[PDB]
């Protein structure tokens, strides 16, 4: 019955269908609401719903040589949790 | 170490009191069993092609030559509701069996001993574990060992002293720019290269990337007796 | 690892564009609330099996531009930067061997195959440049000639065997990697485990369409043929024989797919254990990371699964 979203300037054609009601951004963050085919959605910045590509993590290339080594000097003691029914 | 362990237990009390979705694996079992019993009750009010859903209504308005048709539509519709509820509960009982066998394996390896399996009893090098009780489940507390600060050095596979190659027994060779020392792989402790930390085998011709240094002999102050 | 996500509709499958059929479906209770809740939880679980296997680390590591690994050639498993699809030579051979309107929909997966190949290339750059240190803390730079000196000590072999025979081990490693490229280009029956997942999901959907042409004791199978011939006191009886005959066809498809989802769940938990014990370290268990004394492993991508390359002694 409802046809109030077909005004325009909000379509974003994806591989699962066009997302009517969210604008497209060029950034890439760790998404929480999965949509499909790499596209995600979130409610962040006057707030709106954004749509972007899901990022896979930070970029960190390590150094590498034929005569280089890395030896640790300190340590932290960490206590984690795990829940199993 | 004792100050870092006592501060890690206090962070769990602040994380369990503030966050309300820390036990989502245990509340999903209670919510799935609640929706399965609510569907079995609400299907008693269906007609399945009969006159009414109440068995006391069709038994009073019609004859037993006539009411045998309307009762048959209510029995067959309600028998498929019990066959569906048992079948879905028999698959969920197999999923909770695999979670119980996994918790029994971690009770013997992570708690009752020390496991060398990577990413089984926590992230990092596992030291010990403590179990905790929970409604319809268990809660583990994995104490691990994580290195923090790093430093770059210069390494070498072996050293040649007087025509013989010297390989380390434990650890690797490092260098601060001028001298050479022997240290472990997980912690930095510089030691003097003696004959007790080396292993003589062959010459220094076939080793690719060998350097030249000296190996101290502890029998040199022995001759001053 | 995973299966094909799907979803069925109750309105268009049982009632072929008929408002008279939908009025009789409301008397059967909430049968289709349970049928849509069951197939939704399967499609969510198929996206969770790819998260516990591939997303073991979250920091993306890169290969240095100069190749100096002591004589070892990793040009068959590293991705090709010239191709638009970031895949290797072995991943291009694995993706070439594995090969409507009645409410049947196929939902696309969340993690794209390009994004899966970046997870595999990030772990290949971790076991080479760091080895076992990037899975238990921060990444520590270790040369590749010094990594096998520690891995040989774990199986009871001293360091004199590796350093005095560096040319012999490097020649045997490159000849064994290239032998799989000559094997996967000839025989196609090695990927029979991944082909049975697609064939079982195709016969389960072809049977669901062919059961719409059955009469189930009625006059005809078309719902438009009964409404245009019969009076509605009589047309309700022939329609009710088609609703019950088609409701049991849908309950068989959901029940048979809930056991296949539990079989593919046990194969995803086994693959997630081998990605942490055989790839991120050296395992002492016999016949877990290959036959013999295990040294290291390399993960590879595959359609609806994983492919391991264990290196033994």
Author numbering:
A (entry chain B): 632 to 676, 689 to 728
B (entry chain B): 923 to 1147
C (entry chain C): 729 to 827, 854 to 1067
Q: Which sentences did the original study use to describe this structure?
A:
The S trimer uses its receptor-binding domain (RBD) to bind with the host-cell receptor ACE2, followed by a substantial structural rearrangement to fuse the viral membrane with the host-cell membrane. Here we present cryo-EM structures revealing two conformational states of Delta spike and S/ACE2 complex in four states.
To visualize the impact of the substitutions on the spike conformation, we prepared a prefusion-stabilized trimeric S protein of SARS-CoV-2 Delta variant and determined two cryo-EM structures of the Delta variant S trimer. The two cryo-EM maps, including a one RBD-up open conformation (termed Delta S-open) and a transition state (termed Delta S-transition), were obtained at 3.1- and 3.4-Å-resolution, respectively. The population distribution of the Delta S-open and S-transition is about 75.3% and 24.7%, respectively, displaying a considerable population distribution shift to the open state than that of our Kappa and Beta S structures (both around 50–50% open-transition ratio). In contrast to this, the 630 loop in the RBD-down protomer 3 of G614 S-open remains structured. Moreover, the Delta S-open structure displayed a further untwisted/open conformation with more distorted 630 loops compared with the G614 S-open, which could reduce constrains on RBDs, resulting in higher propensity for RBD-up state of the Delta spike.
